[PDB]
């Protein structure tokens, strides 16, 4: 009975602020993945103090790693509802010509290929919710047409992996949207931190906390519906972003 | 001199109609690249034909094979002003659910970092031209603003990878028109996505004629960091 949520990146900056949010609620089931759930001390605390969270191995990209997680949530509740994905990497300082190819790769496997597997993994339980959700937290660094209405930060590797991430969201909307009743959509989280600061400071930046911007976030989740949310780029402003 | 040419790909999909009609223009010098050039015999009839046309080795994502080029290109004519990066992949019938990863790294590699290697690798020999252009050939697929009307192809791996390198171009354009005058865009042949890697292929003759037209006339202030089709039209993103 209870709403059913799968969230990765769940140790850090926004992953963690939407399970500490959620695992307020009455009625929910939360699992917080982690590339190493034991020492992942802060989710042990928030399972203890709320017994709404169960803190999960799920390394980026790891088909493994999905492969287990979905079994144990099939065991222990039978569907996924929410299916949030924010395990993402943001490497500051990449200018075009003297970054190698493999750290564009590493961006594109992180940022693309982690919400990818974990579809892939998971879409069977999203398939046994009435009404399946499938949120990418992505950033309004990955619009193509923000573009050339930005100012350069260095930071093309993290929106390459970005835009790329919002056109396999667009394709599982046109794929399974109708078909599920399912909501694929990737969100702007806005710019988070937290003192986490002089990591937007060293990058050459509108400050969200984590907290803040989660609270935003779970308002567009709770309210999607398709026609208004499927396939879209949404801001946790509530405005629509250009591709 | 001669108005220097780069062409990665250039008998896949509309390469080849491109090269051949350049290669009959006054006053040019054309690198096409081939995977594998001792394969590439219609690419050697053209160049025994014309004389302006230089069949070489460029595999897509390989940085020795561009940076060999390079060394090759500064040698010779010692500056790019044309780069053209039309070389990819786009494998048939890879459905989101069941692909496998590799398959996306692939296309990514191919038609992402592809163009990448190449611009870093010719980025010295495009800032001796006088007026620098760098084109990426893409489809209607790589338009992430299209995907929820358009016909599912099966085609994901593709256009990820091309929404991809759409994004790089415009980074490209933002970071470097500013920087050198440099004209970086994406255009859109007008042919089906499957065509557009098929080997020595709107016809591709119309195609290149229409290509060739923007290609002439781009300006920074209108082409650059744009998405283009062969008609003269802005495609969204
Ligand atoms: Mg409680
Ligand atoms: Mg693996
Ligand atoms: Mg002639």
Redesign the interface.
């Known amino acids: 009975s209870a709403t059913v949520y799968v969230i990765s990146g769940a140790t850090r900056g926004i992953g963690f602020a939407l399970t500490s949010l959620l695992a307020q609620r009455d009625n929910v089931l939360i699992f917080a993945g982690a590339r190493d759930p034991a020492k992942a001390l802060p989710l042990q605390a928030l399972a203890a103090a709320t017994g709404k969270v169960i803190p999960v191995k799920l390394e980026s990209?790891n088909?493994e790693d999905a492969a287990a997680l979905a079994k144990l949530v099939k065991e222990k509740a039978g569907k996924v509802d929410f299916l949030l994905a924010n395990a993402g990497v943001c490497e500051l300082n990449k200018p075009?010509?003297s970054t190698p190819?493999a750290t564009?790769?590493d961006h594109?496997?992180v940022n693309?290929?982690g919400p990818?597997?974990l579809?892939?993994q998971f879409?069977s339980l999203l398939t046994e919710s009435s009404s399946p959700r499938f949120f990418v937290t992505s950033s309004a660094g990955?619009?193509?047409?923000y573009?050339?209405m930005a100012p350069?930060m260095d930071l093309?590797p993290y929106?390459?992996?970005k835009?790329?991430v919002?056109?396999?969201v667009?394709?599982?909307?046109?794929?399974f949207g109708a078909k599920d009743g399912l909501v694929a959509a990737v969100v702007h989280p806005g710019l988070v931190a937290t003192d986490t600061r002089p990591f937007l400071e060293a990058a050459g930046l509108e400050h969200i906390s984590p907290d803040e911007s989660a609270a935003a976030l779970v308002k567009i989740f709770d309210e999607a519906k398709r026609e208004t949310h499927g396939?879209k780029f949404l801001s946790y402003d509530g405005t629509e972003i250009?591709?």
């Open positions: 990209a088909e075009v010509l190819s564009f790769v594109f496997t693309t290929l990818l597997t579809f892939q879409y990955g619009s193509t047409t573009v050339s350069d093309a929106g390459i992996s835009a790329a919002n056109h396999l667009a394709h599982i909307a046109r794929k396939g250009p591709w």
